[PDB]
């Protein structure tokens, strides 16, 4: 689908048997979701953003369905204001920027 | 053009008569740039990133040339690790996401 930027590009993702909305973020190198427990085990990781660093739980090889497309990748869990879908998963669904 | 997300989506912007590299960020509602003074007058503003809140200088009605296209909008200046073009100016160049 073609999504415009007049609004925040928010899609629906399925991860862990539950549906939740996430923002499409071309500026994020990784996918950081809001603090929760995913089926698997993590490692500690520190990510840098605008105005600080945050400590997040890194869950590897997690299966996530982004808008129909089944995808697998690393997802970080932490105190983020919004669920973010970064480049690592966006490349897997074939997402491009056009102008 | 059609830009893929394997690499970071960085383009060239001319702002204030000088050209510099920036990152296309669909998650950033606003456009934030690394500290410098632009030909205009600013007012204070506090925006929040994933790490926390930060203080920036809000400059209104500044003209930018995102690779050919000439646009007009609000640019923020602050301690950001990289120059980012948010949705406020991306809509003006006709930027969309497609997968
Ligand atoms: C994601 C990390 C993974 C690894 C790195 O890639 C990494 N990078 C990033 O974080 C990049 C920047 C970067 C680039 C290169 C290197 C380091 C950093 C920014 C990110 O794309 C977007 N980020 C998403 C979450 N988010 C919100 O949803 C949000 C929205 N609105 C809020 N509110 C609430 C209602 N209020 C009325 C108003 C303020 C609040 Cl608090 N928060 C803030 C937003 C952001 O930064 N937006 C701007 C306008 C402030 C700039």
């Amino acid at each position: 689908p073609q999504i415009t930027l007049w609004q925040r590009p928010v899609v629906t993702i399925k991860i862990g048997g539950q549906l939740m909305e996430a923002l499409i973020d071309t500026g994020a190198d990784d996918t950081v979701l809001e603090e929760m427990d995913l089926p698997g085990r993590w490692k500690p990781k520190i990510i840098g953003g605008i105005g600080g660093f945050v400590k997040v739980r890194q869950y590897d090889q997690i299966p996530i369905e982004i808008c129909g497309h089944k995808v697998i990748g690393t997802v970080l869990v932490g105190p983020t204001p919004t669920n973010i879908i970064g480049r690592n998963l966006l490349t897997q669904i074939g997402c491009t920027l056009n102008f």
Side-chain angles (χ1 to χ4, degrees), chain A:
Chain A
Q2 206 185 50
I3 303 176
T4 51
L5 303 173
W6 299 101
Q7 286 201 258
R8 314 182 89 140
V10 179
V11 293
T12 298
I13 63 168
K14 187 180 182 65
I15 184 170
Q18 61 194 314
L19 315 182
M20 44 180 259
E21 54 175 81
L23 179 88
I24 295 185
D25 202 312
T26 60
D29 297 310
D30 323 281
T31 300
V32 191
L33 307 166
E34 292 179 342
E35 194 59 75
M36 69 173 99
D37 279 290
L38 303 179
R41 52 169 45 223
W42 54 276
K43 299 150 278 294
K45 188 184 176 67
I46 288 183
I47 54 183
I50 282 190
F53 282 88
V54 154
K55 187 184 291 182
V56 289
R57 299 176 170 176
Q58 168 178 348
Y59 288 86
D60 285 0
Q61 319 311 116
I62 284 287
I64 178 173
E65 238 138 54
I66 311 176
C67 236
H69 310 248
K70 191 279 303 144
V71 149
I72 277 147
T74 305
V75 326
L76 312 176
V77 166
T80 175
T82 358
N83 295 329
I84 301 173
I85 294 176
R87 294 194 294 104
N88 75 309
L89 300 190
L90 291 180
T91 64
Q92 306 299 112
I93 58 169
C95 196
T96 34
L97 285 163
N98 304 296
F99 62 81

